Each structure stands twice: as C-alpha cells, then as structure tokens.
Write a protein that holds these residues in place. Structure first.
Motif, short mmCIF file in Angstrom:
data_model
loop_
_atom_site.label_atom_id
_atom_site.label_comp_id
_atom_site.label_asym_id
_atom_site.label_seq_id
_atom_site.Cartn_x
_atom_site.Cartn_y
_atom_site.Cartn_z
N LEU A 24 81.79 15.59 83.18
CA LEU A 24 81.21 14.78 82.25
C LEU A 24 82.07 13.56 81.86
O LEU A 24 83.16 13.52 81.87
CB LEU A 24 81.15 15.39 80.81
CG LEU A 24 79.98 16.46 80.64
CD1 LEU A 24 80.43 17.00 79.10
CD2 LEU A 24 78.81 15.83 80.59
N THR A 25 81.37 12.34 81.73
CA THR A 25 81.83 11.10 81.53
C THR A 25 81.38 10.69 80.14
O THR A 25 80.42 11.18 79.53
CB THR A 25 81.44 10.12 82.62
OG1 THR A 25 79.95 9.76 82.34
CG2 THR A 25 81.77 10.47 84.04
N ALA A 26 81.95 9.49 79.75
CA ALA A 26 81.28 9.01 78.57
C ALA A 26 79.96 8.55 78.53
O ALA A 26 79.36 8.33 77.53
CB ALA A 26 82.19 7.80 77.97
N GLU A 27 79.56 7.99 79.64
CA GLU A 27 78.04 7.62 79.87
C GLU A 27 77.15 8.82 79.76
O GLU A 27 76.21 8.74 79.19
CB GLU A 27 78.03 6.90 81.26
N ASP A 28 77.61 10.00 80.16
CA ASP A 28 76.77 11.20 80.23
C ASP A 28 76.76 11.64 78.76
O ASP A 28 75.84 11.85 78.30
CB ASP A 28 77.64 12.17 80.92
CG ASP A 28 77.62 12.38 82.55
OD1 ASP A 28 76.79 11.50 83.11
OD2 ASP A 28 78.25 13.04 83.07
N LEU A 29 77.78 11.67 77.81
CA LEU A 29 77.98 11.85 76.80
C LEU A 29 76.77 11.07 75.77
O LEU A 29 76.18 11.31 74.95
CB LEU A 29 79.13 11.84 75.86
CG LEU A 29 80.10 12.92 76.47
CD1 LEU A 29 81.55 12.98 76.03
CD2 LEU A 29 79.67 14.51 76.53
N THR A 30 76.81 9.59 76.12
CA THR A 30 76.11 8.61 75.48
C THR A 30 74.76 9.02 75.69
O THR A 30 73.68 9.00 74.82
CB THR A 30 76.32 7.44 75.91
OG1 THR A 30 77.65 6.87 75.31
CG2 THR A 30 75.28 6.41 75.24
N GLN A 31 74.28 9.38 77.03
CA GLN A 31 72.79 9.68 77.44
C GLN A 31 72.31 10.92 76.77
O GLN A 31 71.44 11.18 76.49
CB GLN A 31 72.72 9.49 78.85
N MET A 32 73.35 11.96 76.50
CA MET A 32 73.28 13.13 75.88
C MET A 32 72.97 12.87 74.22
O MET A 32 72.70 13.80 73.76
CB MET A 32 74.38 13.93 76.06
CG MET A 32 74.45 15.46 76.36
SD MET A 32 75.86 16.10 77.00
CE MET A 32 76.02 15.18 78.15
N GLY A 33 73.31 11.71 73.89
CA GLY A 33 73.22 11.47 72.10
C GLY A 33 74.54 11.54 71.62
O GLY A 33 74.27 11.72 70.18
#
Ligand SMILES: [Cl-]
Length: 63
Positions: free
Chosen positions: A37-46
């Motif tokens: 997981l990346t910070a981009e993944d988290l963001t896209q995850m909400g």
C-alpha cells in the motif's frame, strides 16, 4: 511477522479500526493484500488524513 493474522486485528492494534470498512470495500481483506500500500492507494481508498496515512504506512514498514 507478519505479526497480525487479520486486517481487523492489525487495524485495532494501531487504533485504525475506524477504517475497517474502507479496507473491505476496496477488497483488502487479508494481511497480504496490504503489504504494498502507498499514500496514493490510501487517498484513493478515502483515507486522506496525513497522520492516519502515516500511522498505517509506518505500521506496514514495521512488520
Ligand atoms: Cl494473508
């Protein structure tokens, strides 16, 4: 580890179980699902609050 057997156990241990639905609705229901997981993944995850992203990403790095 991995020192946690369930996503739910892991999230509870880092006090981020508030995000359990976010993980499940993104289809991340095992520990192996989260390792990359990346910070981009988290963001896209909400999951966008930076200290929470940090809590989660630091935990994974700590495994
Ligand atoms: Cl797993």
């Amino acid at each position: 580890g991995i020192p946690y057997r369930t996503v739910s156990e892991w999230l509870e241990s880092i006090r981020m179980k508030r995000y359990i639905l976010h993980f499940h609705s993104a289809g991340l229901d095992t520990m192996e699902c989260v390792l990359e997981l990346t910070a981009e993944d988290l963001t896209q995850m909400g999951i966008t609050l930076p200290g929470h992203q940090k809590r989660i990403l630091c935990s994974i790095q700590g495994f």
